[PDB]
Amino acid sequence: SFVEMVDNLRGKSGQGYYVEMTVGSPPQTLNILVDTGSSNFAVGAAPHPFLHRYYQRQLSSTYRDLRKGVYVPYTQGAWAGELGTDLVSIPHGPNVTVRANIAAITESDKFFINGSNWEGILGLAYAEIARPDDSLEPFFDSLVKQTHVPNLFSLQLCGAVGGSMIIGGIDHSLYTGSLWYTPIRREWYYEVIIVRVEINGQDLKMDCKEYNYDKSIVDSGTTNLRLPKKVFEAAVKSIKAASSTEKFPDGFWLGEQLVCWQAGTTPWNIFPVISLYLMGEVTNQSFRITILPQQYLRPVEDVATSQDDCYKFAISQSSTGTVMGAVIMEGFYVVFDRARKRIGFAVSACHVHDEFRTAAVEGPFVTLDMEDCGYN
Ligand SMILES: C[C@@]1(N)Cc2cccc(c2)/C=C\C(c2ccccc2)=N\C(=O)c2cc(cc(-c3ccccc3C#N)c2)COC1=O
């Protein structure tokens, strides 16, 4: 029944998944980045070199200036704008219209991406991390309070881009196998708990507290699988050992160097699979999501339809905890079940795989003392 929401996401390889959103009156449709790592709805509202279009508040009769500024600094980039509210709809999303808070971005630094084709960002996380503070109600909260749309959305990000953002439910055609759920530990970022990490079936053997030191979150707006320094180092040592058939320069594993292969010759088979075990919904029960090199090895903006496929190792370090970005999400259909405070994972019907291996979601496994893996 959610068919009209299927394939409502677009994007350029490595630049961000976006959905169309129509704001104001008369209608002003813009391409908006789907971001589960933040909670502010904001759109470019002034000309910018990297922006094809922008929000023109003076042309919207329903726009209400809140007479207050807002500044938002992200892990990457930042912007400044004016707060206000206007009518908002998602053409290929739920059949409703709501009055939501909207930040009109007038200035920014290293936020927008040249050629990405998106002009704003939809922060889908909770109010706790919204700017200026948690009193600025996020878009999804307004949606649920003003309409009968169920408190849940799901994301199918298809990498090389496109995908689907199903709002108010789950579309069975977007995944195979069963959906496995992990609890949302706290409602601020979409925080989860990783209890075990394996490289080609081999346990990384680190104290699970290190996997979530600070926190572990799911962010559709982050490209890589980012890991805490100590975890990153151990993971890389293990991945290098498992892919010893061919040697690569140190810089490759640091994302400083790229390696290209003749079209259709990338030796996926020499790279290991990576499994992250997440806390399940029942005591001492966990499940695992497994990604292939096709997920963690990202394609880089082609030179011009050349006979060379260049890739970048998309697993990198973080000083603010684990971030399960696009590298993780592209292999699965992810359900953000806000209503039941849980996130579900299932094999995506569009994840890129080969004839030898496939991304997977498997369970259940017995894992004790999972509660002690979270940071307080
Ligand atoms: C909350 C927010 N998600 C906001 C945000 C900030 C800056 C840019 C974007 C979004 C645009 C979309 C984009 C994507 C997303 C999926 C697919 C393709 C591109 N992401 C990036 O480009 C991006 C985003 C972030 C860190 C690095 C980043 C920085 C340094 C080292 C490694 C990195 C990675 N990964 C790169 C931190 O993300 C955020 O703060």
UniProtKB/Swiss-Prot annotation:
Modified residues (N6-acetyllysine): K68, K205, K209, K215, K229, K230, K237
Molecular function terms, GO-annotated: amyloid-beta binding; aspartic-type endopeptidase activity; beta-aspartyl-peptidase activity; endopeptidase activity; enzyme binding; peptidase activity; protein serine/threonine kinase binding
Listed GO biological process terms: amyloid fibril formation; amyloid precursor protein catabolic process; amyloid-beta formation; amyloid-beta metabolic process; cellular response to amyloid-beta; cellular response to copper ion; cellular response to manganese ion; detection of mechanical stimulus involved in sensory perception of pain
Record: glycosylation sites: N95, N114, N284
Annotated localization: Cell membrane; Golgi apparatus, trans-Golgi network; Endoplasmic reticulum; Endosome
Enzyme Commission code(s) on record: 3.4.23.46
Inducing stimuli: Up-regulated by the Ca(2+)-regulated transcription factor NFATC4.
Topological relation to the membrane, as annotated: Single-pass type I membrane protein
Extracellular side: 1-376
Highest taxon, organism lineage: Eukaryota
Catalysed reactions listed for this entry: Broad endopeptidase specificity. Cleaves Glu-Val-Asn-Leu-|-Asp-Ala-Glu-Phe in the Swedish variant of Alzheimer's amyloid precursor protein
Activity regulation, free text: Inhibited by RTN3 and RTN4.
Enzyme active site: D35, D219
Domain Peptidase A1 residue range list: 17-346
UniProt keyword terms in alphabetical order: Acetylation, Aspartyl protease, Cell membrane, Cell projection, Cytoplasmic vesicle, Disulfide bond, Endoplasmic reticulum, Endosome, Glycoprotein, Golgi apparatus, Hydrolase, Isopeptide bond, Lipoprotein, Lysosome, Membrane, Palmitate, Phosphoprotein, Protease, Signal, Transmembrane, Transmembrane helix, Ubl conjugation, Zymogen
PTM entry text: N-Glycosylated. Addition of a bisecting N-acetylglucosamine by MGAT3 blocks lysosomal targeting, further degradation and is required for maintaining stability under stress conditions. Acetylated in the endoplasmic reticulum at Lys-68, Lys-205, Lys-209, Lys-215, Lys-229, Lys-230 and Lys-237. Acetylation by NAT8 and NAT8B is transient and deacetylation probably occurs in the Golgi. Acetylation regulates the maturation, the transport to the plasma membrane, the stability and the expression of the protein.
Enzyme's top EC category: hydrolase
Bridged cysteine pairs (disulfide): C158-C350, C208-C373, C260-C310
Chief place of localization: membrane
A Gene Ontology term for the protein's cellular component: membrane raft
Tissue: Expressed at high levels in the brain and pancreas. In the brain, expression is highest in the substantia nigra, locus coruleus and medulla oblongata.
Record's subunit section: Monomer. Interacts with RTN1; RTN2; RTN3 and RTN4; the interaction leads to inhibition of amyloid precursor protein processing. Interacts with SNX6. Interacts with PCSK9. Interacts with NAT8 and NAT8B. Interacts with BIN1. Interacts (via extracellular domain) with ADAM10 (via extracellular domain). Interacts with SORL1; this interaction may affect binding with APP and hence reduce APP cleavage. Interacts with NRDC AND NRG1.
Family to which the UniProt record says this protein belongs: Belongs to the peptidase A1 family.
Function: Responsible for the proteolytic processing of the amyloid precursor protein (APP). Cleaves at the N-terminus of the A-beta peptide sequence, between residues 671 and 672 of APP, leads to the generation and extracellular release of beta-cleaved soluble APP, and a corresponding cell-associated C-terminal fragment which is later released by gamma-secretase. Cleaves CHL1.
Descriptive protein name: Beta-secretase 1
Species of provenance: Homo sapiens (Human)
First-to-last residue of the parent protein present: 59 to 446 of 501
